[PDB]
């Protein structure tokens, strides 16, 4: 139910580069991993790439191996998708979605001779959980 904004699409020539931007609000962007789904008009969905909450684990597709880049910036709450070596088959709609696991904190910073103060998170477990429940409007990318 949170808002999803997608932008950065356009019409580009083959072999060019483009950047797609997805924005997050009303929820913690750091707490959810990102995925990119491609869908040509009139055909089924196609998974493209996935990144965890921290960004350590990056996963890509056999059709886009070595040519798609996906990154996340939690400070600005933004998702960057970098395109390399475009082809005419890439004309499709790209959908922005999030995760569901709601990663928690395994450890918090402490102060022994207190132990009662609220201190920021130290270590955390999460990521993966490649299930998408909220889908944004998406962006249209045309290659010609």
């Amino acid at each position: 139910q949170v808002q999803l904004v997608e932008s950065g699409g356009g019409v580009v020539q083959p072999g060019t580069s483009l950047r797609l931007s997805c924005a997050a609000s009303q929820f913690r962007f750091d707490g959810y991993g990102m995925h990119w789904v491609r869908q040509a008009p009139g055909k089924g969905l196609e998974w493209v790439a996935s990144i965890s909450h921290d960004g350590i684990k990056k996963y890509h597709a056999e059709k886009v191996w070595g040519r798609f880049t996906i990154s996340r910036d939690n400070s600005k709450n933004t998702l960057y998708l970098q395109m390399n070596s475009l082809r005419p088959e890439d004309t499709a709609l790209y959908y922005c979605a999030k995760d569901l696991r709601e990663d928690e904190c395994e450890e918090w910073w402490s102060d022994y001779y207190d132990f009662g103060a609220q201190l920021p998170c130290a270590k955390s477990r999460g990521g993966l959980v490649g299930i998408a429940d909220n889908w944004g409007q998406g962006t249209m990318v045309t290659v010609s």
Partner: protein, 232 residues
């Protein structure tokens, strides 16, 4: 007792793990430590692990092999992983000095008999093109793939309405979100997932997709071709 009894030997495929173990008694296993042998044909004797008393450290000659103990139980577990063709030999567990003195080279006393360890040897989902049934009937959708994607990993279902964003309906084949009613059910068998829809209506007309997720292998994630539902 003092003699050592070993267990867990057998045959392993290259790229697996074992749980070698050995137990002993004899009212004198507080002064000694327990480690393991390795003797391959044509070669001399080496060592693989030595759980040193007086330090609790699990020394080993390679990174893969690890020795471990559990409580006061007089049993020692040698865990080995990422096995390779050379690791086929006669594994014996023996007793070394109180502080795991020179091993991988020594020949101790109070040794066991020794077990035997021998080592030797693009998927796309298939879905029907479209389905059709009378309103209020039950429909079934089959998503058949491979062992790595569906057999070894869970399957998620997605519904895309015409000119609308997709929506999650089934996750790990046995649970549904709050906004989705119970009219949809899912099951898995071997490498095939089956989705059953009851009380189909006009509003359910959409394109359904099956996907899998796993970070272990890159062939594991795969989205289905899609099934079209038409209500007469």
């Amino acid at each position: 007792q003092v003699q050592l009894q070993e267990s867990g030997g057998g045959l392993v495929q290259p790229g697996g793990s074992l749980r070698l173990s050995c137990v002993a008694s004899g009212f004198d296993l507080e002064n000694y430590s327990i480690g393991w042998f390795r003797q391959a044909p044509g070669k001399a004797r080496e060592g693989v692990a030595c759980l040193s008393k007086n330090s609790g450290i699990g020394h080993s000659v390679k990174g893969r092999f690890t020795i471990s103990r559990d409580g006061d139980s007089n049993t020692w577990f040698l865990q080995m992983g990422a096995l390779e063709a050379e690791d086929t030999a006669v594994y014996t567990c023996a007793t070394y000095n109180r502080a795991c003195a020179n091993y991988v080279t020594i020949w101790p006393e109070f040794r066991g008999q020794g077990t035997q360890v021998t080592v030797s040897s693009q998927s796309v989902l298939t879905q029907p093109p479209s389905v059709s049934a009378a309103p209020g009937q039950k429909v079934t959708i089959s998503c058949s793939g491979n062992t790595s994607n569906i057999g070894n990993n869970f399957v998620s279902w997605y519904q895309q309405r015409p000119g609308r964003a997709p929506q999650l309906l089934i996750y790990e084949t046995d649970k549904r979100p709050s906004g989705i009613p119970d009219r949809f059910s899912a099951s898995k068998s071997g490498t095939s997932g089956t989705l059953a829809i009851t009380g189909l209506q006009t509003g359910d007309e959409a394109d359904y997709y099956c996907a899998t997720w796993a970070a272990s292998l890159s062939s594991a994630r795969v989205f289905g071709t899609g099934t079209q539902v038409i209500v007469l």
